[PDB]
Amino acid sequence: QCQDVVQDVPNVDVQMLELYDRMSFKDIDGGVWKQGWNIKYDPLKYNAHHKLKVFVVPHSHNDPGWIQTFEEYYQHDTKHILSNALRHLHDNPEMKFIWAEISYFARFYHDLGENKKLQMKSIVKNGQLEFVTGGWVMPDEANSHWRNVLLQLTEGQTWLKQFMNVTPTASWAIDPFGHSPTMPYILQKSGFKNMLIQRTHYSVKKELAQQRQLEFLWRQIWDNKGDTALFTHMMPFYSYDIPHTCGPDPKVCCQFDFKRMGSFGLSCPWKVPPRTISDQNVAARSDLLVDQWKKKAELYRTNVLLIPLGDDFRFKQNTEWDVQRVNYERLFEHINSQAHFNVQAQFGTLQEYFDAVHQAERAGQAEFPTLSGDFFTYADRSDNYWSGYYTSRPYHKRMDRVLMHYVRAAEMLSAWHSWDGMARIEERLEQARRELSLFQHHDGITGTAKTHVVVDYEQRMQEALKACQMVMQQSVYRLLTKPSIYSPDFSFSYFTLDDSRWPGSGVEDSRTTIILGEDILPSKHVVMHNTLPHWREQLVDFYVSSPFVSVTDLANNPVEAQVSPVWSWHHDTLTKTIHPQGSTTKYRIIFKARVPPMGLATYVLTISDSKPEHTSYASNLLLRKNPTSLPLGQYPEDVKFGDPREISLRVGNGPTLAFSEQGLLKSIQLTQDSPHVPVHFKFLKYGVRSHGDRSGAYLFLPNGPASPVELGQPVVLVTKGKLESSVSVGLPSVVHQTIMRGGAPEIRNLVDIGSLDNTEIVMRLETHIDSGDIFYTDLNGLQFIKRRRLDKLPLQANYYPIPSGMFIEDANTRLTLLTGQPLGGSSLASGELEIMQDRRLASDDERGLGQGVLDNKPVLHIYRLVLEKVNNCVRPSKLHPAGYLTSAAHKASQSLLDPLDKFIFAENEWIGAQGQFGGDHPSAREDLDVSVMRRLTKSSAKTQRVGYVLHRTNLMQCGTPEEHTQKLDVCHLLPNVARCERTTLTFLQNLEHLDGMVAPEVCPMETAAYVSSHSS
Ligand SMILES: Cc1ccc(C(=O)C[C@H]2CC[C@@H](O)[C@@H]3[C@H](O)[C@H](O)CN23)cc1
Ligand SMILES: *[C@@H]1O[C@H](CO)[C@@H](O)[C@H](O)[C@H]1NC(C)=O
Ligand SMILES: [Zn+2]
DSSP: OOOOTTTOOOOOSEEHHHHHHHOOOOOOOOSSSTTSOOOOOOGGGSBTTBOEEEEEEEEEEOOSSSSSOHHHHIIIIIHHHHHHHHHHHHHOTTOOEEEOOHHHHHHHHTTSOHHHHHHHHHHHHTTSEEESSOOSSOBOSSSOOHHHHHHHHHHHHHHHHHHHOOOOOEEEEOSSSSBOTHHHHHHHTTTOOEEEEOOOOHHHHHHHHHTTOSEEEEOOTTOSSOTTOEEEEEOOSSOSSGGGTSSSOHHHHGGGOTTOSSTTSOOOTTSOOOOOOOTTTHHHHHHHHHHHHHHHHTTSSSSEEEEEEEEETOSOSHHHHHHHHHHHHHHHHHHHHOGGGOEEEEEOOHHHHHHHHHHHHHTTSOOOOEEESOBOSOBSSTTOBOOGGGTSSHHHHHHHHHHHHHHHHHHHHHHTSOOOGGGOHHHHHHHHHHHHHHHTBTTTTTSOSOHHHHHHHHHHHHHHHHHHHHHHHHHHHHHTBOTTTOOOOTTSOSEEEEOSTTTTTTTOOOOOOBOOBTTTBSEEEEEEEEOSSSOEEEEEEEEESOSOEEEEETTOOEEOEEEEEEEEEEEETTTTEEEEEEEEEEEEEEEEEEEOTTEEEEEEEEEOSSOOTTEEEOEEEEEOSSOOOOOOTTOSSOOEEEOOOOEEEEOTTSOEEEEOTTSOEEEEEOSSSSOOEEEEEEEEEEOOOSSSOOOOSSOOOOSSSOEEOOOOSOOEEEEEOSSOEEEEEEETTEEEEEEESSSSOEEEEEEOOTTOTTEEEEEEEEEOOOOTTEEEEEETTTEEEEEEOOTTSOGGGGOEEESSEEEEEOSSEEEEEEESSOEEEEOOSTTEEEEEEEEEBOSOOSSSOOSOBOOOOOEEEEEEEEEEEOTTSBOOOTTOSEEOOOHHHHHHHHHHHSOOEEEEEOSSOOTTBOSEEOTTSOOOOTTEEEEEEEEOSOTTOSSEEEEEEEEEOOOOBOSOOOOOOOOOOGGGSSSSEEEEEEEOTTSOSEEEEOGGGOOOOOOTTOEEEEEEEEOO
């Protein structure tokens, strides 16, 4: 049935980890092809019976924000490009053009009059204008979560099906900075047949070109059978621009970019301009161009050649359309009529190229190699590795993950009902999906846009978060109010969200205090949502105006609670210390919420005059020389003080953690009897080189290994409670916090790099674990891939994306660090993990951004730290390129990415309140998630349709008996099911009509989509 993703090592022609181990990475001058060699070809290879078929594919790379905002580029460039494309393609039936970014196309098309809409539909229908990929954007592939890659693909493709009646099956990704196998994974499950990539390490291009392995069947690293395979074309040269797409010599190719003759303010840096094609020069020009084509053709296996023709924001001016088209038409007429060339050249689209390639394949003309692995970390030249952008603008990287979850929760909570148009549910959800989708752009989440553009993305995401809150809170009120009492004002706020970790303590004072008092309001209802499809317990906290508060469920059962102070950290510019102040006007109440699968649970907070029976109070200990009193308004326990010292803590039956006198972890003891395993946190700093290339938004070019941050004598705060304990320390640039709730600790860093120019702050873990040169990092929150540290490569080359987690292990022990935000990281020595927190860079790194990174702001990074014994786990063999999380580590990741949502009832009394929603929902096996639940129809549809994306991960078998859980059949989650279909992941095509309207669960590492149809 299901493929074994652990025990069978796939046999592939190219495995990128193995390739990396063998390659030398020498950066030698290859001649005109600076990073290759002088290509030779046999002129007699092509003849009358075997011609070279050449497809010249016009394109225009349009960034949805970079140096300008989306709207600035739309007004100044893109609207003119699309307008002139429509005119010129309409008027010139053999001209072709491909388009990738649907965010721009939708913006344009909706502003068109009906006549022009019809013209546009016609040039798409007839194949002149072809959409490639069809996502809202061309996303980053390093930092993006797979769920958001799917979100943005679906946004663009849903628009294309509705308005243009097409669904692309070829993908075009010419600009992301390195490439991820998460893309073919999603694309192949979304009906795609082909994909194209460009930005891969120059040494990889050379190696694959030499073996004619630039076209390959890209399968997942664990895929033994090959069912995930997607045909992939890797472009061979340094850029997608015209000088680097006609052939190996940019000095020649530049002469065939007809926009470079002077009137457009562009020129050829190789000092030879293009010249207008005429009858007197066409033979000579053709000879030069065809020679380039035949050289490029040597790197591939068929007699069909792809020649992209484009660059950034090209095909704007009418004069540009003419100058490219007329000159190429003259070259085609000459070349195609001269038999001695044995070439047939034409304008084409991307699908046309792929179709012809596979025709050649089926004719037995070529067979293609299989490949697995990824294409990180990218270098475009010399030692310029693009690992900086794994961390750049970390505030917005963390915001990405927050909004990811709010979109999921808003779509899910509102999916349970059909909503009247007046509720504006669909409107708000579309806005939220679109702003988050926009941010997936390869200058959005990457932190590689100009300062004002970053601000635009932030403002858009803030509006998206507000839209999610509105939808979520309307949905909670409807789900938990007696139906005959339910009386909505769709503009009113029945609940406000409370979020403990975004923007976070010390980032924004954004949270509302629950105000109670005998003379004002004795009690308050709160509600938790659990977006995951299994019963879940999690500690939750709220701010309250009194420490004397107790918690009940809606059956009035007491719930054990803990009250702690509200601590905030301050750089005391008077004492020159970083130390905590306690609130005298508000307090934190903490309790364990238990919430049904995909459901809601209601609790009540009630004030009393004195300590309630079921509420305890944390002790607080401030460790510093030279202490002063710390009064806490009404809080019942006095703060204690002491000189700095080592401390040890244990919550519940959980691990025992020991800390240095500087408030940093030193060891973890898993059980009563077990060893105190050395696990040490350390903060260090990287600098920038004083001569040669400087680090910037893209590039990480350290001036050597990191140096320890000088800690001085930092102030340490220890809070000890029955339910939650913590150690917090004010370090230079970081308030570092270790929180213990009875399992793996949570780590929070409040990172404020301040005015520390040319500094990158790293958090490192030092252990004994005999990992050697092996570590594991994830790809897009989807899969874990084996990394091998290579000392033959510079430090920055050994940095990889940490989009959600990383681990090291030996035969017996593993340490896993899970993240709530994508950052860059590595293991630079056996037993180490490290992850960059922020970076402030004074210089530009010469990739067109034209600024450093000097717009840092405070950010709250979050993590879980999981130390485990793994000697009993069934792990992949030493040759397997994948790794897998344990149950504890997977749950720890879910706690960061999809926590419980918290809602505080806004008015004094909630008439008709109910205690629970979803008590009858199936509690699915722990490795299964309902990644997406989305109602697909508006209220006026006779047949309602609801879409589900189901993802099953793969967890290691380590000897824990599995408990019987319930089968999850998403098609029966809503009543009156009439049909259940398996669909592509975008929901746009039906793949299978399902027996008995039952949606089967998926295999480990598989993702499936289902749509249920409901007659009532
Ligand atoms: C002198 C110079 C050299 C290289 C470049 C790029 O690669 C720019 C590429 C890659 C980075 C990315 O931020 C940008 C935008 O997305 C543009 O589309 C071009 N991209 C630019 C200038
Ligand atoms: C859309 O394209 C399909 C498939 O080519 C065609 O049959 C149909 O007439 C077009 N219009 C629709 C489905 O409205
Ligand atoms: Zn770009």
